[PDB]
Amino acid sequence: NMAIIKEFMRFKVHMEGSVNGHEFEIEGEGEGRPYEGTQTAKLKVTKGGPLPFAWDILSPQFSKAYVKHPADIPDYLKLSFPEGFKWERVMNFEDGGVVTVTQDSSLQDGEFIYKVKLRGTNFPSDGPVMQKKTMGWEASSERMYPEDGALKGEIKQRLKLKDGGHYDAEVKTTYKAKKPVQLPGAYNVNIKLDITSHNEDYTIVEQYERAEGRHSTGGMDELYKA
């Protein structure tokens, strides 16, 4: 609703997780312009810091309410509020690392509330994640489509490395409204996530993300719709 999701919205996030058995907690808050598809966040490691792995595997887990949509693509996730939605993600990294994530999103007292759980496993002890050799995500295209009564997204997601190379992951996410709301058809979401600042050990980190939905069919008529 245009009433309940305002042009500027704040959020609080809590993550509990483990990577290669190393347990941690993160608390953060953020803000942005949901209909414009822009947001920032500041995250703080509150337990298990400093983290012995790349911040970059956590950054994409910290807000799909802030995606710009053409007027004629049902904004399924915005419409799930105030009750909200859940998402479940699997990231298969090319060296056998795996990240599984679950998230609950709701709207409480006019603020989004995000609860995240993360399990990262089988990262090579001397690979770029555990050795902190990553340098942020390339811009991504998430292919969205409805399936089994939920909204699914698939990404071929690419991390830049300090050595000039790259490090890839296959990602699939299911996004499911807690109440029935109309699912969209297939379309793409262009995403760019930046680490804007961090302290030396990444126990305080600031992110920015821009995300915009675009039609993937419909030709010039649907182009730049909205």
Cα angle: 141, vertex 144, 145; to 5 degrees: 155
- DSSP type of residue 68: B
> Measured between alpha carbons, how far is 83 from 168 in angstroms, rounded to an integer?
34
User: Using CB under 5 A, which of 96, 149, 165, 185 touches Cl ion?
Assistant: 185
User: Using CB under 5 A, which of 20, 100, 188, 203 touches Cl ion?
Assistant: 20
User: Using CB under 5 A, which of 24, 177, 184, 202 touches Cl ion?
Assistant: 184
Ramachandran area for residue 34 (φ above 0: left; ψ -120 to 50: alpha; else beta): alpha
User: Using CB under 5 A, which of 48, 49, 82, 136 touches Cl ion?
Assistant: 136
Stretch that binds Cl ion, among 67-75, 80-88, 98-106, 161-169 (CB under 5 A): 67-75
Residues 151-170 that bind Cl ion (CB under 5 A): none
User: Using CB under 5 A, which of 16, 29, 194, 206 touches Cl ion?
Assistant: 194
Residue 70's CB: how many other CB atoms inside 10 A?
Answer: 17
Stretch that binds Cl ion, among 43-51, 154-162, 165-173, 212-220 (CB under 5 A): 212-220
What are the angstrom distances between the C-alpha of 160 and each of 129, 141, 202? Answer: 11, 16, 18
Q: Does residue 76 sit in helix, strand or coil?
A: helix
Task: Write out the residues near Cl ion by the rule CB under 5 A.
Answer: 6-7, 10, 20, 67, 73, 121, 125, 130, 136, 184-185, 194-195, 214-215
